Structure formats: structure tokens, C-alpha cells
Amino acid sequence: AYPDADIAKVAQLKSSFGPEFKVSEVAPTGIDPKLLSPQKLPEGVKFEPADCAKFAEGQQFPPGLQGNMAATAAEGEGNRFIVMAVETSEPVPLSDPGDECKRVKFLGTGARGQVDVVESPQIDDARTVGTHRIIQTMRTGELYNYVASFDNYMVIVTANPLVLPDKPVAKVDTERARELLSAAVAAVRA
What we know:
- The protein is mainly β.
- The chain has three helices and nine strands, in the order E-H-E-H-E-E-E-E-E-E-E-H.
- 13% of the residues lie in helices and 40% in strands.
- Residues 6-189 form the DUF5642 domain.
């Protein structure tokens, strides 16, 4: 379907960031599901709605998947953006909450937080899902995740405030994150 698709083409998105950004890259290499999924929630935390517990974990990559990943990341204007492109031997099941689970809260001794579905862009022949994770750990850590799924490809944009010692926090540029997702999918596909 996507004959010339190549996760290595995420390198193209370097040119999507101005001189105020520091850009880095991860060359194509075997997948590491731990680097791809949101960080694991602590044990014993309780969920609300309780039936929405799975969606709190965000996009998962099953431990059996084979595949490769490449990434482009940028830090600047008080944000970090990571654009990851993944190709697997079969499609990754997409995490896609219904309205019942568009907000999940959780609470435990080590942690408390919230995972909301947020607007994500329409991308031709792809499914897209956006979330906003706000996590307090023993304190607040925040990020936006945008996922695009097509065939055996998955593209993930993660955007978070830079939290630097003794500096104020900036708001996340979610507009830029969403445009990075569209641009990355178009770059990877052709």
C-alpha cells in the first residue's frame, strides 16, 4: 500500500525546527517497547472509571512484536518534541478510548494523575488518537501523545514541557505537535 514507506524518513523533520531548537536523531534500530509506551503506572493505584484502567496505560507495544524504530527529537521554546516512527511485522493494536473512557483518573500512594483524550489530526488512511497525561509522582509531570496508525506503521509524537532546575514551566505547543504528526506520516509514507 505504501511502497516507498521508510521510517528512516523521520530524519526529514529535522528541518521542521528553527535554530532555537536543539535537534537529535535515533537512526533505525530494533524496537524497544519500553521506550515507545508511556512510563508504567505504579502498582496499587486505583482507577476512575475503574473499567477504564487499560486506557490509563496509553499506547502499548506487546512484548512479542518484531520491528524497527527511528526518531527525531527537538528541545527548545520550553518544549521537547519526540517524533518516533515504527514499522512492525504486524500492526500494533491501537489504543482508542470511547467516550466512556475519554477521561481516566488514578490515585495511589506514590502517584496520582489523569489521562484525557484530546483532539488529534485527520490523516488520510490512518487512525489517529491524541492524549494528555498529567501525572503527579512522589511533583507534576505532563505530556501530550499523538499516535498515527496505518498498515504496519505507527508514528508517535510526544510533546512535554521542559522541566529545568529553577526555571518556569512553559505551556506545551500542541498545535506544533499535531502538525509534526501529519508531517511525519507524510514523510514516512513517501
